[PDB]
Design an enzyme around this catalytic site. Structure first.
Site, short mmCIF file in Angstrom:
data_model
loop_
_atom_site.label_atom_id
_atom_site.label_comp_id
_atom_site.label_asym_id
_atom_site.label_seq_id
_atom_site.Cartn_x
_atom_site.Cartn_y
_atom_site.Cartn_z
N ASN A 1 -6.30 -8.03 -3.32
CA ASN A 1 -6.51 -8.83 -4.53
C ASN A 1 -5.27 -8.74 -5.40
O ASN A 1 -5.09 -9.52 -6.34
CB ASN A 1 -7.66 -8.28 -5.36
N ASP B 1 -7.71 -3.44 3.43
CA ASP B 1 -7.87 -3.65 2.00
C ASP B 1 -6.91 -2.59 1.44
O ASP B 1 -6.72 -1.54 2.06
CB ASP B 1 -9.31 -3.34 1.60
N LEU B 2 -6.28 -2.87 0.30
CA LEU B 2 -5.32 -1.95 -0.29
C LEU B 2 -5.89 -0.86 -1.22
O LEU B 2 -5.94 0.32 -0.86
CB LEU B 2 -4.23 -2.74 -1.03
N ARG C 1 -11.86 0.53 -13.62
CA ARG C 1 -12.09 0.11 -12.25
C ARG C 1 -13.23 -0.90 -12.16
O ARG C 1 -13.13 -1.90 -11.45
CB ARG C 1 -12.40 1.33 -11.38
#
Lengths: 220, 220
Positions: A117, A8-9, A39
């Site tokens: 995403n 995941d980034l 966020r």
């Protein structure tokens, strides 16, 4: 026997706390408050939009989330400040151990990919800026599927691109909700819990829980 | 020309702040903190579970959310306390104007229904306890559809049960995310914003924004 690893980034390889600085530089004193809400709305908008089947890319979701945050705090976010804060996500800083660990995993002959995403542009920018572009075989974005995580169609994308079966792909994620999804999909999952949070109560349990990528390298 | 009205239950007709009391009675001083997190995990678990296609009813989601909250705060939630706090949701208190407004809307010959995430049992308990059962033509739960809001399959359920087209059913909701969904579905939407919050940044805008049900009665 794992042959590949999906990462995941935002929040796993790269730190989003970098944004709080730019936020406080724009709205002195409230930087932490802005970033926190930003966020949260960012994630909420990706979840809610996928459920309503009204998709817009991550960059759009990020702009929309900032616009809501400022309007919600009473802050006057002008056009240039908007663009400026949003550009911060293209320059995140990788967690300390991230760079050296990526090299060791790659050296062990492991296929490394990013399932994020973020838009294809966002992902590229972030990794290239940090100069880690070469250490990745695939940089996958949810964009082509027009839906966000934890939709199984997103995870399936990683399995197809890597050309391996889910059982030979390790999923590394810092978000317990992301790890829950990948675990439901079938990926053996490793949760990176640096800050000692607790796993989500959604029926899943990761296969491994570690404090950083260091433990991952030593997993091989 | 509206012929029916669909109401969200938790937070729109009945106040969930009633729970903070029972929470503080069990964990003195931390009642507000527990309730806040509980409410958030409750919603998150319904959203995430629907996306992973791993459904459990609202009562289960509520129990799971409390278990996470206490474990997350370091609180020792024993079996009996768990059952006790969870039973609080079956005794919520309706907002002051709710009772009289329901009577006036009904008197105007309007079909009134409840479209809630709660289980058929939960919904029943709450309305009957408050003694408002008779003022509702339909008490709809998402349970039969095995998925939660804002999934369109949930809203469709209201349109079928009332036997009217979505354009003749008014959707009344306090949660801006719920109103966004119903608005996307096609329901003319009325948002009850008592605490002066701002609408979500998910492309939608309600048709009406009012401070209480009073304004709704006067809408007819």
């Amino acid at each position: 026997y794992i042959k590949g690893i999906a990462f995941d980034l935002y929040g796993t390889l790269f730190d989003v706390h970098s944004v709080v600085g730019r936020c406080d530089e724009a709205f002195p004193g409230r930087g932490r408050e802005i970033s926190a809400l930003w966020r949260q709305k960012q994630l909420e908008y990706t979840w809610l939009r996928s459920l309503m089947n009204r998709y817009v890319n991550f960059q759009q979701a990020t702009e929309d989330a900032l616009r809501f945050t400022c309007r919600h705090l009473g802050l006057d976010l002008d056009a240039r400040t908007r663009s400026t804060l949003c550009d911060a996500y293209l320059r995140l800083a990788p967690f300390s151990e991230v760079p050296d660990s990526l090299r060791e995993l790659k050296r062990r002959g492991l296929k490394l990919a990013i399932l994020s995403n973020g838009s294809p542009q966002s992902i590229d920018a972030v990794v290239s800026h940090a100069g880690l572009r070469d250490g990745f075989d695939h940089l996958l974005s949810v964009d082509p599927v027009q839906v966000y995580k934890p939709d199984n169609r997103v995870y399936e994308l990683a399995e197809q691109a890597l050309g391996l079966d889910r059982s030979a792909i390790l999923f590394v994620a810092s978000n317990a909700w992301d790890a829950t999804g990948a675990r439901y999909f079938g990926f053996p999952t490793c949760w990176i819990n640096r800050t000692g949070n607790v796993f989500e109560e959604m029926g899943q349990t990761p296969d491994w829980e570690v404090t950083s990528l260091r433990a991952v390298v030593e997993l091989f």
